[PDB]
């Protein structure tokens, strides 16, 4: 493949999100600030910041249809941002009623409701009441046991894949009346009342991420044991047809994105993304998209010479510092789509603790 480094953030970024037109993107940093960036010719430049929160901002997600930004942070509060006609953005607090720090947020594919993961044993799902202009949260506390580490919606807009930190993968129905209509019968189930245990699957570690297939009839989750498991549901209260597990020889995976109806791209502490080709019969690692082991008479400038003396003085080597082969320098955060019709993705972006926002061109 081929990758282009979009920007070099000065600080680690655990999340990013692009607008529908892919014109400007929002990203988080280490502190309570949330950063905005816009294109400057061939590069990107700073746009504005948000200091509404008080503690470390955890996750940020952009709604492409309505062009809205939500932000859930460690301060147990959620802010929803909508741009004003003049150009500025209007903040709006959402009362999550949580007891611990939020961890992960996602917009529904219809963007009517958004679910919030949390370490307070619960998950908060919020919608908008036009009659009161209010956001109200509902707690999902029946089967949950540990911290929420990831979220994943379903194309039916009702099922919600929750990646818990109790070595068990969770799927729940987030259907709510007055917002969503009745959903069609699904392989996951048909009778879907609010807060019902759709499915439960085990793992060999904390479920860092979960993901439904583009067809919507599967789940893929990765534990902390560097193993990605692809689930194929059969019927309600019926064991899945096949639980394919692929075990790797690298660092544990972090986030999972579905390249197409039969391909999964996932990246973690290995500083690189991977690809999975297969079907119901099985799966296997296909290729290392990060070039693998690439290992990538003249005057000396004043800055270089000063650097050489500083390294010599503070050090005993005065040699090149890292020269790390992989494009990223630290653990990767997440993978999100960039362009293409559903089930047809060729470009997807990624962010990491090094601050690099590296687009990946399949």
């Amino acid at each position: 493949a081929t990758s282009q480094v979009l920007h070099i953030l000065p600080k680690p970024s655990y999340e990013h999100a692009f607008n529908s037109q892919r014109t400007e993107f929002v990203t988080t940093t280490a502190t309570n600030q949330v950063e905005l960036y816009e294109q400057d010719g061939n590069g990107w430049k700073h746009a504005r910041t948000f200091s509404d929160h008080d503690k470390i901002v955890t996750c940020v997600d952009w709604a492409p249809k309505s062009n809205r930004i939500v932000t859930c942070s460690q301060d147990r509060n959620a802010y929803v941002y909508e741009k004003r006609p003049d150009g500025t953005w209007k903040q709006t607090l959402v009362l999550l009623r949580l007891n611990r720090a939020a961890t992960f947020v996602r917009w529904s594919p219809n963007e009517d409701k958004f679910a919030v993961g949390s370490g307070a044993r619960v998950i908060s799902v919020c919608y908008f009441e036009q009659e009161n202009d209010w956001w109200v949260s509902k707690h999902l506390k029946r089967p949950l046991r540990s911290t929420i580490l990831s979220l994943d919606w379903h194309p039916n807009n009702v099922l919600l894949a929750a990646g818990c930190a109790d070595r068990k993968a969770y799927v729940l129905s987030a259907y709510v009346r007055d917002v969503d209509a009745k959903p069609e019968a699904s392989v996951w189930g048909s009778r879907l009342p609010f807060n019902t245990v759709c499915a439960e699957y085990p793992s060999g570690g904390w479920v860092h991420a979960v993901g439904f297939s583009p067809s919507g009839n599967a789940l893929a989750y990765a534990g902390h044991d560097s193993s990605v498991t692809i689930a194929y549901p059969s019927a309600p209260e019926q064991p899945p047809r096949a639980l394919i597990t692929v075990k790797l020889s690298q660092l544990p995976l972090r986030s999972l994105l579905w390249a197409n109806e039969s391909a999964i791209v996932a990246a973690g502490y290995n500083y690189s993304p991977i690809l999975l080709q297969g079907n119901e019969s099985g799966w296997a690692h296909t290729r290392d998209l990060d070039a693998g082991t690439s290992k990538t008479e003249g005057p000396v400038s004043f800055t270089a010479l000063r650097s050489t003396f500083r390294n010599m003085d503070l050090k005993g080597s005065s040699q090149s510092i890292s020269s790390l082969p992989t494009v990223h320098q630290n653990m990767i955060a997440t993978l999100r789509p960039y362009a293409g019709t559903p089930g047809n993705i060729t470009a997807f972006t990624s962010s990491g603790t090094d601050g690099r926002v590296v687009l990946w061109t399949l």
Partner: protein, 185 residues
Amino acid sequence: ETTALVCDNGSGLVKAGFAGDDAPRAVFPSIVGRPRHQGVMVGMGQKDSYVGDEAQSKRGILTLKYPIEHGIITNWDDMEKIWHHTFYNELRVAPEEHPTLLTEAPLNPKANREKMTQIMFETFNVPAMYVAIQAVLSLYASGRTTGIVLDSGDGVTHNVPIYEGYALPHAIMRLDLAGRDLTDY
């Protein structure tokens, strides 16, 4: 990080600037020239002495005289005036806010260096200062560790051979012939 003034009061020019700058931002001749005419004209606030570029520009009716002679200071009052000019009218930084870094030729008289540090501490109230050697700094700028450095400024020409780290103090040869003598010839 810890910016410090770097004043190299050479015998012909006074190159100055902050630490870490790519090139010095304050270069001007080390000349103090008083007028030598009656000056019946009144007004315009005619000063009693001009230093540096102003002296060079007004040299038509000024008695220019260098305050240093072959690296050795001989006009301490004039040199104090030049230092005041460098600190205030050219760099525009308070002396008591940044440390300074001076240079002097090898084998110079000890009283010269003693009075240099005495003035820069008692008068300008600088926090700290150091008196390096021109050859060592030239070795720094050359990006090497060994070699014999031939330094020849306006005042004096001197060679300080330096091996890896260590500098031999018995092989320092100093010759007074320099740019001023060449100009006189």
